[PDB]
Homo-oligomer: A and B are copies of this chain.
C-alpha cells in the first residue's frame, strides 16, 4: 500500500510591500511517523516518493522557467539523513492552443468539472532506502522561487 500526507507551506512576509512576489522561499515541514507504528519500514521494499504539486496556469506562473524543489529528511533533532534536488518545469502550452482549449472545453469548465489546473508530479527518491535503522521522522521540502502560485501539495510515499 501507499499512504499520502498533505503538505502545508509557509513563509514569513516580514518585509515591505512587494508587487506580486513573496518574501522568502516557501518551506514546509511535513510530518510523518504518527502515534501508531505505520511509517517508513525498517528494511522494507524500497520507496519511491513523489511530490504531487499543484499549479494553475496564471500568466505569472507561466513566466518562471525552472525551479528546483529540494528535500531533506530529518530523524531526531535537527539531524539530516538524506537530501536531494530536482529541477522542474511548468508544462508549456502556446497561446493559440490555450484559446482553443478554453473554447473547445467550454462545456466542462463552466460547470466545475476538471477546472484549469496543471498538477505536476516529480519523483525525487526513486528507490529510497532507510539505512542504519535510524527512523525518518519527516521531511523539510522547499521550492526555490519567490514568484510561484500553487494551491496545495501531496507527498506520495509508495512501495513496490
Contacts and interface: CB of A to CB of B under 8 A. Distances in A.
A98 interface: yes
Contacts of A150: 66, 89
How many protomers of this protein does the assembly include? Answer: 11
Contact of A66 (B87, B115, B149): B149
B56 A87 contact: no
Nearest to A115: B91
A140 to B, nearest CB: 16
A114 interface: no
Interface in A60-95: 60-61, 63-66, 68, 85-87, 89, 91-94
Contacts of A11: 68, 87
A101 to B, nearest CB: 6
Interface residues of A, number: 50
A1 interface: no
A103 to B, nearest CB: 7
Nearest to A150: B89
B102 A110 contact: no
Contacts of A100: 102, 106, 110
Contacts of A21: 17, 65
Interface of A: 8-11, 13, 17, 20-22, 26, 56-58, 60-61, 63-66, 68, 85-87, 89, 91-94, 96-106, 109-110, 115-116, 144, 146-151
